Amino acid sequence: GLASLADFPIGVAVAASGGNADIFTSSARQNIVRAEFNQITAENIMKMSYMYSGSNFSFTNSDRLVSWAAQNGQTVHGHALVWHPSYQLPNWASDSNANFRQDFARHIDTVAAHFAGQVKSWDVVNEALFDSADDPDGRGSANGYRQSVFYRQFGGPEYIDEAFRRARAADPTAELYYNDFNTEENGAKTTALVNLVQRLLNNGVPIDGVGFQMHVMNDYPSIANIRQAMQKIVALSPTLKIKITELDVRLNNPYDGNSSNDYTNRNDCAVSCAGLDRQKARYKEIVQAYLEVVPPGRRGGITVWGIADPDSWLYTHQNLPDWPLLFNDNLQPKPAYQGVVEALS
Amino acid sequence: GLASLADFPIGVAVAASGGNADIFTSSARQNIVRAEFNQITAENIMKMSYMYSGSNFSFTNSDRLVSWAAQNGQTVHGHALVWHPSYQLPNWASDSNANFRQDFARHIDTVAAHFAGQVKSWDVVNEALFDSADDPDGRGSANGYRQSVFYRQFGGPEYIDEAFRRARAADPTAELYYNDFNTEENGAKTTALVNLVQRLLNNGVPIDGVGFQMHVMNDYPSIANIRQAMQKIVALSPTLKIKITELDVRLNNPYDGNSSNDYTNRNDCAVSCAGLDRQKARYKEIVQAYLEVVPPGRRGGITVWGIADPDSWLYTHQNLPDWPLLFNDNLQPKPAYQGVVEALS
């Protein structure tokens, strides 16, 4: 399948929290992963709070998934050491906690050391950049940075340098990624990414690569913008790796000022519609831009953000159905799957 | 069923956009509606852009639903004449449209007149108040108002006055509501709701009632605050109705700073768990508060926001499973349903 077409990881996000998408329980999903992919990212269960039972570390459920990957031909991309959303914050990660920096170091040291040579790569820090459309903390932009509890407790972005350094000491074999979304738009957040990254390289911070989420729509951003965004990063260093971490492709755009081109019914694109054909071309042109802009030896992987459309976070979004992935509600390849094969080939 | 225990509308949101929850297609859902409820709101298909095919009005799909309702014992609550989210804006509702005010008028006048004796009540304006959590326009607060396209085009909140006057002229029998969420917290948004409603009452605007969406969690906000919030609005006018429009109850609170009390697994509360028992009590206490606070005669209805848990918008939220409604994944009544019957009894 897909993995055989590339010399770098071709990954998928897997669910492990019950219900239909559960990788342990869905032997049909297992067989797609075994046939098509060679790396897994935990969709949720390696997020920060999942490392804890109250205040003790607890790795039973995540060790389960990593041991599954190992026996099923998959490396694992660890997602994620440091990330802000309150639902996944350990209980220590509070403005009130005066031992915050200590508990922050023990987290990185303990988790990275625990998975030492069982995980290929980490999102060491995820989503550190201010995003106008996504600021739950409310605080607005601090020089390009999100003012999350980590920023607030460290007084600045130096929690980023510290997470890299600590992870690198704890596991000297792990590929260490900075990961974020909307940095492919080639706008203000892409510029903040380049400055973020230049600063870490200037400081001697051990970062191995930059992760682009790539949660895109069929027709936005344009690929010239995605191309340029990636080019700008590849230019920063002779060595720095580029990984597409979270690739999914929305047929619907609710931000384009045009409600007349929206698919509003679940039946619209269950078998055949123009949007599925554009989706084949859109997956194709992104994987092409990747191969063209990212030299061999610096390709960290392409990962798609789930197995089958009904598993997707976006199978609904903005009160609109969508069909964002390579496999359809029946676990059958979509024209999207072909676009990726044609690009990789 | 529930509707037989009250002398005000006992309603439910129904889906009609394909898949499992589609009311035209699920005889099992139809039978539940016929048994339990006497009012429907369309979850989606009565939103603004659904009234159009391109630039022309198209009432075909919404007429089918309204026909459905009248045939199966249901009144209809219209949702909504005026609302900001971009996914549902007709093509006219643009800063680039020199005819905005004309197109705005023609929308209200046409849709209201078209449903005139067919829909009992309207959300006339929905979500006009600024919410710190929910500002996609990016503009912040203008004196407690959301600076939506309607607010910008009017230079202020007088689009609200106009929408109520035009609905009243176009369908003089419809009960005319203002609807909003987080106004039950008794915080800053309750205070802005107070200003909003005072102003309309002051201007002589024909508002009939205030809707509380009531998207709550098991333990937040407290019913003391929910009680006082409603009291504050009942206090404004000797005749203003109160309606519960969008009631659902989350077991998971990912805002309480504790990731140790979350249910992370779809199986957690599939059969029984403590959250389901609290949920019975939560539904019960909210309906009791309603009955206590809102005089008979001023009771606009209680509506629950969907039929069965998997139909719910919150069946997943913040990456966590949830179980928000009165019927379970198997269309069996949950303890939630008893809490309602108890409060109504």
Ligand SMILES: [Ca+2]
């Ligand atoms: Ca669109």
Ligand SMILES: [Ca+2]
């Ligand atoms: Ca919680």
